[PDB]
Structure 1
Amino acid sequence: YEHTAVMPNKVGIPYKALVERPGYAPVHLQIQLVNTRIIPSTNLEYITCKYKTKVPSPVVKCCGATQCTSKPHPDYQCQVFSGVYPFMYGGAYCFCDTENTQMSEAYVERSEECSIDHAKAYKVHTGTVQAMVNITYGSVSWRSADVYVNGETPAKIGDAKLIIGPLSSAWSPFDNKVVVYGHEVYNYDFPEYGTGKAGSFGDLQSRTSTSNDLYANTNLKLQRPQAGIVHTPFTQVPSGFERWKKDKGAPLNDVAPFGCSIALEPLRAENCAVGSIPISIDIPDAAFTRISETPTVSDLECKITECTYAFDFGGIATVAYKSSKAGNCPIHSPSGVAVIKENDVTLAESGSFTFHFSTANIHPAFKLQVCTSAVTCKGDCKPPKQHTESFTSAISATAWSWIKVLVGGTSAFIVLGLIATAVVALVLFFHRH
């Protein structure tokens, strides 16, 4: 047998519900989410990390000059330098005259943390959602099960042909352009992939680690070697993306609302418990039994001992009753106002016993079912002093329904007499003639 439902998103809290059938004894369930897994169809786009800058041997002669070329490197420079006149220790100044020979050829390359550590710049696409649950139904114990959100998924565990949702709600806080270092992760508005951002963030403007395409600019500029010093004075840009690696902010996981978190590899969002889920599950109709063979109900009465409106099922109340014959029988809460600790109990002969429950009410007047026999225990006044309550408006009290009807009736009656007055007068005036 298959029974379906729409359950609200309750990542932590369990969910029982008794399920019955004419001529058949009922059976309960217990569904309880274990995971929520929201996997976008993302991908990385390009990486970035610190650069490096090397210099080849700067040319030199006694006179004349060599020539600067396009030694292929990012931001690479080279320039002749004339009348160099540089000395070497215990030397002869490398000339007899104007040296004129100094190219100061340059080179820019990439750092080595890049291997260990580099940018992780992503485009994040639609992708999927899934989730894990636990079913402890009927006669079944903890059966934790995981499946995708899609309202189609045919999944059978034992006799449970799971069909899930899909969820009413349709969003997770993500973004197409989100980057990450280490455990942390950050929506970078856009990693300016092709566009060399002066190295300000695109310090390593490369598709991959192994993609040796540095469309970045350290703005390397050479200065004239001088002072008889063999060197390549120069300038270039500081590692701007590192400069931001001083200005890193709050990772999104730390900002994710609904007190829920994220998984690294799939960008699985983790249990932002929002929405409702139209689930559909097959049950073993064999697990049913008859309805007439059952120890039957009778002599229905329950005593509302006491509840104080608190989170824990902070209310105890009992029953007083006489049975057809002893045994066991479920006590479902079709109205989960006083959220019952219990869902199924033994029913001994004259089952006259208690139970526990929480409602946010100052007091209810409600009822629920037991052993295919819904009985009424209204719910006394409740003292005040993680988890839910009833809380909608069930906290109703005496004075509320007292004064509301007081004022309504007073106004109604007075205005009714008022309107009566007019025709009451007019009738005999008509009678005059």
Structure 2
Amino acid sequence: YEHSTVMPNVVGFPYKAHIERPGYSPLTLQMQVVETSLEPTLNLEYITCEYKTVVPSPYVKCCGASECSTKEKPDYQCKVYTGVYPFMWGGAYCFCDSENTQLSEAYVDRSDVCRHDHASAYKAHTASLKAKVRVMYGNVNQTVDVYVNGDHAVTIGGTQFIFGPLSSAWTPFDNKIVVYKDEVFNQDFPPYGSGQPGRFGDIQSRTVESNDLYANTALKLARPSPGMVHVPYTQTPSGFKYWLKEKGTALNTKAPFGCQIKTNPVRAMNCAVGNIPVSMNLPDSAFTRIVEAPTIIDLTCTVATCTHSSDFGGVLTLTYKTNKNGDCSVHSHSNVATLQEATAKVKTAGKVTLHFSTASASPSFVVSLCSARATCSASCEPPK
């Protein structure tokens, strides 16, 4: 049988399907979601941390020129200054006046603490939805994990279940995100190779261990005024350390729809968004049909006690007669009240106690038992 309902995406909401059939009633089906997990597929774009700026000993040569070479270090510079340390009192003990030269150079390395303290910038791509639904119909209190796409399928009690594509494509994560510690940020970080100086991503490395590193910190060599052999410069201080003030508006601060943003896998637990279309292929054996099912007669419904708007304040009992013992499927045909249970062990005695929830002073509602039905009423007030 091709049963198909559309339940709501909300944790701890007990759904009840009951779309009927010739032959016999639809074994009242209970199912509710235990947890959501909206997880986006990430591409680690790069790593950034603060930088350790590196400056070799300068190379001086009296009465003779130095020539700069290309080097493949990050943010690498070298300039050959001329006329730097005039005479021997000029600061290098050189003979010539102008004709002395200094090759000055520098480059940026990954901080000495980058493995401990750093961030990851991800491309967060189309997210897969994962549930942990507990299904209940007949004799199964079995629970299950399943992708809430239109594709994946699970057997439960020999019944196929497919929890369809979510009715909403919403996500709290943007096209680009950034993770630091246990927090995540929606952030348009600069791409690898184009990080700009003094702001986030000034240094970029594919991974942390990755040996390669793109740096742009406006590292600017300067001319050594006569005084001592040295190598001065004008860099821009890390944008990582700068960004640790612009880190703040984290997603886990704001929980739209009760989302819980958790760290190690980037995700959104128990987000209450949208409906879950469900579809299932029940075999005929899953039903307990009427020629085989027990006939009950003289079905009546008394209510012992009841509370206004509690979790399950109601306490009703059903008197009846049946030809033999079996397994019925109780269910209310009036939204004004709902039953804690959806099945009951019908004995020969003629007495089945049920518990139910409501939110009315004087409700009237049609309770069924197997194929039989009856009407129930009571007076109900709330506690302090």
Question: Following TM superposition, by how much is the alpha carbon of 1:54 offset from its aligned partner in structure 2, in angstroms?
Answer: 1.8
What is residue 322 of structure 1 aligned with on the other side? 320
What is the alpha-carbon distance in structure 1 between the residues aligned to residue 357 and residue 156 of structure 2?
32
Give ranges in structure 1 of 5+ residues lacking alignment: 386-433
Which residue of structure 2 aligns with residue 8 of structure 1?
A: 8
Moved more, 280-289 or 169-178: 280-289
Contact 1:75–1:218 at 8 Å: present in 2 too? no
Name the structure 1 match of 2:229: 230
Identity among equivalent positions (%) equals: 49
Q: CA deviation at 1:45?
A: 2.3
Alignment of 1:283-298 (within 5 A): 283-298=282-297
Q: Alpha-carbon deviations, 1:68-90, whole Å to 9, x = none? A: 52553415243525235688xxx
SS at match of 1:241: helix
1:189 Cα shift?
2.7
Correspondence for 1:69: 68
Structure 2 portions without partners, runs of 5+: none
Q: Distance in 2 between matches of 1:3 and 1:191?
A: 50
1:114-193 paired onto structure 2 within 5 Å: 114-115=114-115, 117-142=117-142, 144-193=143-192
CA RMSD of aligned residues (A): 3.2
More helix as a share of residues: 1
Aligned to 1:103: 103
Query: What is the Cα deviation at residue 277 of structure 1?
Result: 1.8
- For residue 178 of structure 1, give the secondary structure of its aligned residue in structure 2: strand
Instruction: State the SS of the aligned residue for 2:244.
Output: helix
**Once structures 1 and 2 are overlaid, which stretch shifts more, 52-61 or 20-29?**
20-29
Matching residue of 2:259: 260
Whether the 8 Å contact between 1:222 and 1:235 is mirrored in structure 2 is: yes
Secondary structure (helix, strand or coil) at the match of 1:113 reads coil
- Other structure's SS at 1:179 match: strand
Structure 1 residues 198-232: Cα deviation after superposition (integer angstroms, max 9, x where no partner): 232122045555373525133334252543x3332
CA distance in 1, matches of 2:360, 2:377: 11
Q: Compared with structure 1, are the counterparts of its residues 158 and 304 closer, same or farther at alpha carbon in structure 2 (3 Å cutoff)?
A: closer
Cα deviation, 1:310-334, whole Å, max 9, x if unaligned, reads 3421222334x23134534331234
Using a 3 Å threshold, how does the CA distance of structure 1 residues 226 and 362 change in structure 2: closer, same or farther? farther
Q: Does 1:342 align with 2:341?
A: yes
Shift of 1:25: 6.5
> Deviation of residue 345 (structure 1)?
2.0
CA deviations 1:91-148 (Å, max 9, x no partner) are x963456584433333333324344554322222224323221223211222x22222
1:42 and 2:36 are equivalent in the alignment: no
Q: Which residue of 1 aligns with 2:216?
A: 216
The total of aligned residue pairs comes to: 378
TM-score by length of 2: 0.84
**Once the 2 structures are TM-superposed, how far is the Cα of residue 279 of structure 1 from its aligned partner?**
0.8
Higher fraction of strand? 2
* 1:255 CA displacement: 1.9
Higher RCO, 1 vs 2 (CA within 8 Å, ≥6 residues apart): 2
Give runs of ≥4 in structure 1 deviating > 6 Å.
Answer: none
The one-letter code sitting in structure 1 at the alignment partner of 2:120 is: K
| Superimposed CA distance per residue, residues 34-68 of structure 1 (whole angstroms, 9 cap, x where no aligned partner) | 3423343432323322222222221335x435335
**Distance in 2 of aligned mates of 1:240 and 1:222:** 22
CA contact (8 A) 1:205 1:216 kept: no
Report the 3-state secondary structure (helix = DSSP H, G, I; strand = E; otherwise coil) of the residue aligned with 1:322.
strand
Structure 1 residue 33 corresponds to structure 2 residue 40: no
Is the CA contact (8 Å cut-off) linking 1:225 and 1:231 kept in structure 2? no
Partner in structure 2 of residue 395 of structure 1 = none
